[PDB]
Amino acid sequence: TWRDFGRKLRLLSGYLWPRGSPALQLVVLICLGLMGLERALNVLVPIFYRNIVNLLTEKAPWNSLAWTVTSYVFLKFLQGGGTGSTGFVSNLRTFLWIRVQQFTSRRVELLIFSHLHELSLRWHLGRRTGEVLRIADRGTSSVTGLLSYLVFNVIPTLADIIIGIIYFSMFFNAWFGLIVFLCMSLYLTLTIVVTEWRTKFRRAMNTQENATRARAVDSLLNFETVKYYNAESYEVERYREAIIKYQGLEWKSSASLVLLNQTQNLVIGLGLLAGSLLCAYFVTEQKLQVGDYVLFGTYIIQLYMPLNWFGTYYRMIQTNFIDMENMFDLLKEETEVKDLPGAGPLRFQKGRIEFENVHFSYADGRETLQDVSFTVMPGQTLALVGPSGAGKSTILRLLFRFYDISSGCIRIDGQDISQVTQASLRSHIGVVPQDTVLFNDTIADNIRYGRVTAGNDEVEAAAQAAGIHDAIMAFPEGYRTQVGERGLKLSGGEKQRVAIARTILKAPGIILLDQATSALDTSNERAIQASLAKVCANRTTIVVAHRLSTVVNADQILVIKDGCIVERGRHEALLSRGGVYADMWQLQQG
Amino acid sequence: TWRDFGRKLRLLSGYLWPRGSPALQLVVLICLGLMGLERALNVLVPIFYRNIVNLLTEKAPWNSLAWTVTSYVFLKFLQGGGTGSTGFVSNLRTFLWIRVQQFTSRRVELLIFSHLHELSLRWHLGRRTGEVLRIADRGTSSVTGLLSYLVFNVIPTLADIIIGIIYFSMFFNAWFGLIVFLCMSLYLTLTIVVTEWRTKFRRAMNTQENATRARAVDSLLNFETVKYYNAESYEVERYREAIIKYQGLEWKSSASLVLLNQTQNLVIGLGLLAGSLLCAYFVTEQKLQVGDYVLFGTYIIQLYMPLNWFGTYYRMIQTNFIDMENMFDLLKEETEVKDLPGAGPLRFQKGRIEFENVHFSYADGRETLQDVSFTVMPGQTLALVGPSGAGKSTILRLLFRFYDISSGCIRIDGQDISQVTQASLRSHIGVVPQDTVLFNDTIADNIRYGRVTAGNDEVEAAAQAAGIHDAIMAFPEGYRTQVGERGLKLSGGEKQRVAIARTILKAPGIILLDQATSALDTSNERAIQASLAKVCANRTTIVVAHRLSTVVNADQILVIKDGCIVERGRHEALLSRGGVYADMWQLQQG
Ligand SMILES: Nc1ncnc2c1ncn2[C@@H]1O[C@H](COP(=O)(O)OP(=O)(O)OP(=O)(O)O)[C@@H](O)[C@H]1O
Ligand SMILES: Nc1ncnc2c1ncn2[C@@H]1O[C@H](COP(=O)(O)OP(=O)(O)OP(=O)(O)O)[C@@H](O)[C@H]1O
Ligand SMILES: [Mg+2]
Ligand SMILES: [Mg+2]
């Protein structure tokens, strides 16, 4: 796991260089120039600080001494207290860097948003909304956060120490190039041998931080269930008892940073001790001058200054790794249902749906559909009936291709749906869901979301066919009133008639209906069923309903018990047969 | 808005002191002692730095000089580079502070979680899940974040400058107590006159940052709708075009910090210039010594060191105000439905429900219920029928008291429901919702969530009465299989029979049923309706259904057209009447 950390910094460094736009590629080349200019100021500032002490020792005239004191303040104006802090040069590059990190935080955030929608339907049913919406939120601030640390604070610190090794070597002696090298080599070994000890407590925190909020968020996505039952006291005691177990564990991971931050201050405190005693001995033995000690005592401080100011970051270095490693664990998840390479679009001509011996399983323990086979001629309505949990809506998932089949074949107009592109397969198919969800905006946008290029005259026209047109004009604010989140402000039945309406604006070749009359009364189905009959005149319809009066005038009725068709045919051919359909018909008549 | 900022720091400082636990109240008193001990080290470190220059100038013996050089390194070991950085004392208090901020981040996070559930039902229908779940996430890290800045970085900086005014006054002259005071008074006026100019761009960012993510999150809470229609390309172009308008506006708020961060470096660069030229003149006029210039040149740097290292924080000072001001805007929202002070519990004896002329309106434009009045004797089943949008489920909201009524009265056993506590009102009432949501865990916990103290033998017993008991034993993994989030992994009908089951474990005095048979076929209602009839034997039941065969054996049938009762009575009394119920009955028979 230490050789895999070497590519975690290598793959993070691919988001540093702007690609495709040369107007941003020469901002990076002169933010590297200002970064290299500040490395020369870290040397020239203590040099001009011993020149203004030597002239006070040698008693220079004031006309020649004042022109090198303001020369010192001007170079301290440009430095502003070492790297990592804000001098005049150190925030001039920050003024130019905040156009470059608006190109990385734009491309990353549009990458972990266009990847969540291209994942298949099996992933979105097993996710948790608290975990997924947090990683998509804190994912663009971990790449932007750590590239503002690896490029501005770690590399300029390591570049300032190497220059502090070449300097003190050619210009003092061989000794103080060894003391600053032995103190910094001891610094890097005692920040790795503690981090390999610290990793006991940091990886046992990420697995438990997601499990201490996963109940509180899921007690907040469905607010009403909590409300219906006596509660709001039970859900707060389980969140107190799950935040004791987390704050008892982050105590061991926040007070393990102080043990790292006191074993790094002990190394710096020894190299300063071995360096200050050696300069004091060379002045006593008159190898150097007292002005050369002033150069040493103000250069070792600014070398060891960014090593201590980086010590305040370690608990948000860690959070920017946790919010980054969960992002790349997400992006190495391929789509389960893949279109083939070299796939052409679906050529839709008539709308002839055929299953040939399709078998399907959700999780390999049970076969959900066993040898399902039928043929729907174009312009005909097919009816699916049966008990709950038979596999009725699962057939309307495979025709839309959310899921790959195990064996058999699905054909539309003699063309397999697994061969053609899935983005052209579901352009001719329009399905109303069983329980309908709506976007959290105007209802005139929930209806026009079927075909988005439609005008306001066509939205109102096909909302007449859904039967809601005379119910919205009794509302205040007209068509742009609000539904709240997931349509909960309307109704059970007014929520549903929007979903019929959206499908009509799409006007698909194949129309599918999971449940359309469930929340509607008996007076509103044949206002829609007769209105859909002049919409489904020459277009293929697959309907499934639990009430059995709607499918009397259907073309072919299929009965599904446990994923296996027991009997098929028309309405009058199954009442005279006396099978399970006739017993289901007589049970509803009385 | 500048006099209201003075209480934003006053009310934030109420989360500093731990209340009720004296074991944490004496950690704060000696984290104040270590904070006052570091203020004395900021004076004693440059004093011992001019002692080790004066002994090199006076050529002290090595036996007397080495005992004051290690005295300098030991006090630099304790300081570690000024306040805001990590010395040995400056992270000793950090080791003791991370038990105190686990008492504030515990009490704040359990305050903005026990306030979201006590808000009424009108607020949760108009909220957005992306906004609410973010403020509850980033709300405990803004109080903890800013109390680690106001107490550790702002006040110790202002305490180090005042000590730097008393020092340089009594111990040098009257001059350098004026230069460090005139430079810092000019510092505070030019960080207020820029912040009052900056506030144009920071308050126009919070109103637009919530509106650039409110579409992307709401295109992700309902993943399937996006999937059913041709999409995943339309929802990513509207998020690219809404992140150009945000990154074009945060550019004006991130490059307004650099203009603040270069007008603060210009003030520090002048006070260092006016101070270094005045010490150089006093040594030239022999008022002071060259060793006194070394004291000045290493004390003004560490006074002006935390003013530049605080310059790297200003774009996460701002985010910790935005994530804090949205939290206190949330907490000044009272509950709409309030129980009375001095309210006793509901004394439930028989279960006699009475409405007396109740009127109700959602948003004052329309009267939803107009003069609704009925009386339900105990042990009787009431039936509500009518078209969609009539006000049927709204009656089952007022009986549960999500909403206050405008006029009239609601009585249960001769007791008004507005007078008694609402936590005892909804303990005798058990309602199954219309569209049922489930928690994202085992189904044996979704059924036991009605009465949580029930055992496994009673969960399985009352799941027989819901008719799902023989359907779960065909599943793998038994009763602790997963439903995914909001129950979407089960079914439309297996999702619903869990919600009947939960209500039976509660065994309430009054049973309410919005929709119980909507997703179930005709063979599964009378397996439940006969099973509920030996549950509803002596307990009050209010049922409302669109299918009309279920309410034939009801005790009293109410017909609702537009929130007004048109006719009432039994089943045979409305078929011979020939009203709107008989026309609704003949329309379903054929
Ligand atoms: N996402 C899923 N993961 C695992 N199993 C599933 C999933 N969806 C459905 N099943 C299983 O497949 C069976 C078929 O359920 P389906 O959703 O087809 O109901 P249905 O037959 O259409 O009837 P109804 O519409 O009345 O619920 C169910 O018994 C269920 O246990
Ligand atoms: N939260 C809400 N905010 C504003 N208006 C609402 C809200 N809930 C319902 N309404 C309005 O009140 C009317 C009554 O709707 P209700 O939820 O009572 O449906 P219903 O009469 O029970 O019939 P069904 O159950 O078949 O939908 C609707 O026309 C709707 O416009
Ligand atoms: Mg279904
Ligand atoms: Mg309803």
Numbering used by the authors:
A (entry chain B), B (entry chain A): 238 to 827
Question: How does the study describe this entry?
Answer:
Furthermore, we solved the nucleotide-bound structure of human hABCB6[EQ] at 3.5-Å resolution by using cryo-EM, allowing for unambiguous side-chain placement for most of the protein. The nucleotide-bound hABCB6[EQ] forms an occluded conformation compared with the apo-state inward-facing conformation. The remarkable change between nucleotide-bound state and apo-state is the closure of opposing NBDs triggered by the binding of ATP and Mg2+. The closure of the two NBDs leads to an anticlockwise rotation of TM4 and 5, which is a common feature of conformational change within ABC transporters. In the lipid bilayer, the closure of the two NBDs also triggers the rotation of the plug to eliminate the barrier for substrate translocation and the TMDs adopt a collapsed conformation without substrate binding. In the nucleotide-bound structure, the “plug” swinging to TM6 belongs to the same monomer to form an open state and clears a pathway toward the outside, accompanied by the conformational change of the two W546 residues and forming π–π interaction to further constitute a “bottom” of the cavity 2. In this process, the “H–P” cavity 1 disappears and cavity 2 is decreased to extrude substrates. The differences between these two conformations in the TMD are the decreases of cavities 1 and 2 in the occluded conformation, as well as a slight opening of the extracellular vestibule. Our nucleotide-bound structure reveals a substrate-free conformation, despite the incubation of 20 μM PPIX with the protein before cryo-EM sample preparation. The structure indicates that cavity 2 of hABCB6 is not suitable for the accommodation of substrates in this state and substrates escaped from this cavity before the hydrolysis of ATP.
